[PDB]
Structure 1
Amino acid sequence: SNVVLVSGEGERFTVDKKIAERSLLLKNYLNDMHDIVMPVPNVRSSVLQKVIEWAEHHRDSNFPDEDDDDSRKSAPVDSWDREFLKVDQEMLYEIILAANYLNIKPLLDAGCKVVAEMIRGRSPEEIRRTFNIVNDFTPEEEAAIRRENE
């Protein structure tokens, strides 16, 4: 018994039901009445294929919990996940958007840990010294800071 996901571009993908129970949405979209195809809008087919490959990898892995706020902080940076999400930034944000829409907490956590490691190790005094979305900052206040820089 296989379950067909539908991407945004239209390519229908086919997984198994026990595989698709990694999603916390297939488990509550197929459990209506026992007496098969789930659309996923605004997801490009390559992104949903990568999400399906991630779900096919961790078929028998013990993720910690849903409400364990300290195990998420004491972070396991998994090896295959760190090898997996090594793409450019827009592919990464589309995977994280898809994981939020598919209600998949571990992939969301892994993607946000990768983005957290990116935003943690930014260039000191090169990109941190350039604030760029400048709002609620007057030219007088910006001039005061740049005068206080010397």
Structure 2
Amino acid sequence: SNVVLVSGEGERFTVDKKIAERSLLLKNYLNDEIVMPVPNVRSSVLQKVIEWAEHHRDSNFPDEDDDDSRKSAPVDSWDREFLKVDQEMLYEIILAANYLNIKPLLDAGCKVVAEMIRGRSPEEIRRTFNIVNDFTPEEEAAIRRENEWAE
């Protein structure tokens, strides 16, 4: 009743077989202690994943095909302070969840990124403007020519 997460950092994380149900990859892997590689996830972030499962394994979930329970599902305050973490390592958490197909965790990390992308300043959006090419700079000049009477 115990299976072992083996990351790319070799750190054997022996968790319970019940915990493996959050990774659809690993839960369906349970038909084949038991180890499995993870090629990408660094073991601290994997530990964060395990701790998320430690909370939410007792908890309820959406049906993952939803509309309200996907889009208008509010986040957990546990998940909020659980994942107020590094910028780049947040992407790593999301990549972990997308790897293991831990979909509610994937959504929980995802919606924080959504809250980051909206609710950012219009000033920096005016600043961070063509940080990819996306235009010809003549069009950039024409758009700036359009709105400069305000700014």
Q: Tell me the TM-score normalised to structure 1 length.
A: 0.91
Matched residues, percent identical?
99
Give me the whole-angstrom Cα distance separating, in 2, the residues matched to 1:142 and 1:122.
22
Q: Which runs of 5+ in 1 are unaligned?
A: none
Aligned to 1:78: 76
Unpaired stretches in structure 2, ≥5 consecutive residues: none
Number of equivalenced pairs: 148
- Could you list the runs of 4 or more consecutive aligned residues of structure 1 that deviate by over 3 angstroms after TM superposition? none
Answer whether contact 1:122 1:128 (CA < 8 A) is retained: no
- Cα distance in 2, alignment partners of residues 15 and 31 from structure 1: 16
Work out the CA distance in 1 between the residues paired with 2:93 and 2:16: 21
Q: How does 1:109-124 map to 2 (within 5 A)?
A: 109-124=107-122
Further displaced range: 71-80 or 107-116: 71-80
Per-residue deviation, 1:19: 1.3
CA distance in 1, matches of 2:126, 2:89: 24
Mapped to 1, the partners of 2:132 and 2:58 lie a distance apart of: 47
Q: Deviations for 1:40-59, whole angstroms, at most 9, x for unmatched residues? A: 11111111010011111112
**Any idea what the Cα deviations from partners look like across 1:64-90, whole Å, max 9, x if unmatched?**
212112321112211100010001211
Task: Summarize deviations over 1:66-121 as a string: whole Å, max 9, x none.
Answer: 21123211122111000100012111000000000010011100011000000011
Indicate the RMSD between aligned Cα atoms, in angstroms.
1.8
> Displacement, 1:129?
4.3
The answer to which of 67-76 and 80-89 deviates more is 67-76
8 Å Cα contact 1:85/1:111 also seen in 2: yes
CA shift digits 1:8-66 (9 cap, x unpaired):
1111111000112221112111124xx91111111111110100111111121110212
Q: Offset at 1:125?
A: 2.7
When normalised by structure 2's length, the TM-score is 0.91
Which residue number corresponds to residue 21 of structure 1? Answer: 21
What is the DSSP-based 3-state SS (H/G/I as helix, E as strand, rest coil) of the residue aligned with 2:126?
coil
Mapped to 2, the partners of 1:4 and 1:142 lie a distance apart of: 54
Pair 60,136 (structure 1): closer, same or farther in 2 beyond 3 Å: closer
Structure 1, 124-133 or 17-26: larger mean CA deviation = 124-133
Distance in 2 of aligned mates of 1:135 and 1:60 = 47
TM superposition shift of 1:134: 3.5
